PDB file of C-alpha atoms in Angstrom:
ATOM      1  CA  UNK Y  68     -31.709 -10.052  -9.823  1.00 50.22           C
ATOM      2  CA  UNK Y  69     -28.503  -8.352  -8.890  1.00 50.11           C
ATOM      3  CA  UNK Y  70     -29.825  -4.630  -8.424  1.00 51.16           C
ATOM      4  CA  UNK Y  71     -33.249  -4.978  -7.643  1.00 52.18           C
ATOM      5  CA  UNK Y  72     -35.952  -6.962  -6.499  1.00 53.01           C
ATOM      6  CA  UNK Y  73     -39.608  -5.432  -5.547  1.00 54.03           C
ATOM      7  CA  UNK Y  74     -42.096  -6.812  -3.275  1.00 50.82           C
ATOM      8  CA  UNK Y  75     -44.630  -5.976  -5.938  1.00 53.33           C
ATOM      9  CA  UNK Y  76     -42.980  -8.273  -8.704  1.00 52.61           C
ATOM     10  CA  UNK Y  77     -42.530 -10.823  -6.200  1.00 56.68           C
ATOM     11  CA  UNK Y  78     -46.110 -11.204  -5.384  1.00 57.50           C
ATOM     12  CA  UNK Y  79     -47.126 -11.222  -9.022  1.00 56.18           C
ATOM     13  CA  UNK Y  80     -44.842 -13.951  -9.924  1.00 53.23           C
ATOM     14  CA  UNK Y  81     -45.586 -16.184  -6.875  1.00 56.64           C
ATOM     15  CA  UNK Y  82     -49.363 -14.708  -8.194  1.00 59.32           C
ATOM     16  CA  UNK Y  83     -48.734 -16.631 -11.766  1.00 59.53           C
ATOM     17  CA  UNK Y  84     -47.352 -19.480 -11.247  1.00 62.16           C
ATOM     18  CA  UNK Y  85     -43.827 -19.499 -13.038  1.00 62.69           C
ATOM     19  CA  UNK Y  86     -40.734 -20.667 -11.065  1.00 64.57           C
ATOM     20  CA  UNK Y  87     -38.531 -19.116 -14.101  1.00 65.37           C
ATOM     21  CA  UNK Y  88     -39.309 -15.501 -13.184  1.00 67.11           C
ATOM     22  CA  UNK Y  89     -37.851 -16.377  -9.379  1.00 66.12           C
ATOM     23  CA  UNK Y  90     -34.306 -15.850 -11.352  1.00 65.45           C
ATOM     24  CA  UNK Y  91     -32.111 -14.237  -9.182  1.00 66.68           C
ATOM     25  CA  UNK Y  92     -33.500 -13.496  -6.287  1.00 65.13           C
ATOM     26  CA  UNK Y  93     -31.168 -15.360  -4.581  1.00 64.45           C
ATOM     27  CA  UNK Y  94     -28.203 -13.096  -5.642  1.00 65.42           C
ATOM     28  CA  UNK Y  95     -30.354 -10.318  -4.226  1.00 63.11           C
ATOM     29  CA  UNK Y  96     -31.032 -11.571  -0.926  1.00 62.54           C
ATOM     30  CA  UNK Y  97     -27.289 -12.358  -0.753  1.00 60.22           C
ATOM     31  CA  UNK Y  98     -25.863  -9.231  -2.026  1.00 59.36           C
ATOM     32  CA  UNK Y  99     -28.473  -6.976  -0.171  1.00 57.67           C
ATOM     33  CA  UNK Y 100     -28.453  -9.203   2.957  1.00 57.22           C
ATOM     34  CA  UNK Y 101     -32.244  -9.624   3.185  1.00 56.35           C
ATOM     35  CA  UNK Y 102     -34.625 -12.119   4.458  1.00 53.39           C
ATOM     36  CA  UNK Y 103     -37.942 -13.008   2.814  1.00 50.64           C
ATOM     37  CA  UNK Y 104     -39.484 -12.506   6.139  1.00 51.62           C
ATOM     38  CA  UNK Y 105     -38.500  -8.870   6.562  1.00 51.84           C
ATOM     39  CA  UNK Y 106     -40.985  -5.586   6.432  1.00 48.61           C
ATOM     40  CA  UNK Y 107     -39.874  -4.720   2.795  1.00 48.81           C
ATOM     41  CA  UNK Y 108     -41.245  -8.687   1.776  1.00 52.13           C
ATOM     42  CA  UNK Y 109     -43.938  -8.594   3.975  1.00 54.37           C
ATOM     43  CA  UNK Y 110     -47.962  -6.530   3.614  1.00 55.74           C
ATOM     44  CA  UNK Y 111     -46.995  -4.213   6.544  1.00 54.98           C
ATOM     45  CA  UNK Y 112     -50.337  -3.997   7.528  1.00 55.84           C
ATOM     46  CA  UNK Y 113     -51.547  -7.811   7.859  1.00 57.27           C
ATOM     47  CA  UNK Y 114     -48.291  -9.741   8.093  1.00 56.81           C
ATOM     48  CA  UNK Y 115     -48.357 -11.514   4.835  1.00 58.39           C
ATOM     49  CA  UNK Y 116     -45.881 -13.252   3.456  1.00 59.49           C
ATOM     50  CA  UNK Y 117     -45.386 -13.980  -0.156  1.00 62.89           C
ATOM     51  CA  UNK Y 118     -45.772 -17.644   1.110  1.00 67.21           C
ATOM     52  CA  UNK Y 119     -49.294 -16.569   1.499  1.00 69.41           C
ATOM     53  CA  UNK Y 120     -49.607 -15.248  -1.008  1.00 68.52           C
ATOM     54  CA  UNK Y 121     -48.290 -18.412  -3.192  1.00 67.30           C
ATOM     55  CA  UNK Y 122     -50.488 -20.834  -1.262  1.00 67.89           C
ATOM     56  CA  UNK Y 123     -53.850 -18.364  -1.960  1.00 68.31           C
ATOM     57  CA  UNK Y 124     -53.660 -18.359  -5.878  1.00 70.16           C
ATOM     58  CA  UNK Y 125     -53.746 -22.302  -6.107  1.00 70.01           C
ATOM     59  CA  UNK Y 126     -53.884 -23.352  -9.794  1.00 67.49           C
ATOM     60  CA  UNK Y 127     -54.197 -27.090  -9.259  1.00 62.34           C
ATOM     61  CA  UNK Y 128     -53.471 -28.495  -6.083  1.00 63.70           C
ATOM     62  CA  UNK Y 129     -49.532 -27.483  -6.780  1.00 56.83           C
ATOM     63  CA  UNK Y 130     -48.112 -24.318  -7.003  1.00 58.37           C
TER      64      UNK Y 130
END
């Protein structure tokens, strides 16, 4: 939200499925001046993105 916003809780929403838990991570990423694409959001080892990890837990053919 406004203070924080983990990369760990980001992958486990994007993990689950719910858009309602991506609440206010737009505030952070304007407040903090961050990019989704930057080495807190990313694996640090691989690359991944939490794009990737969206796209690999597939529920149906949406996520």
């Amino acid at each position: 939200d406004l203070n924080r916003f983990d990369r760990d809780r980001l992958f486990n929403v994007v993990a689950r499925g719910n858009p309602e838990d991506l609440a206010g991570l737009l505030e952070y990423l304007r407040r903090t001046s961050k990019y989704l694409t930057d080495s807190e959001y990313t694996e640090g080892s691989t690359g991944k993105t939490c794009l990737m990890k969206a796209v690999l837990n597939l529920q149906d053919g949406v996520n």
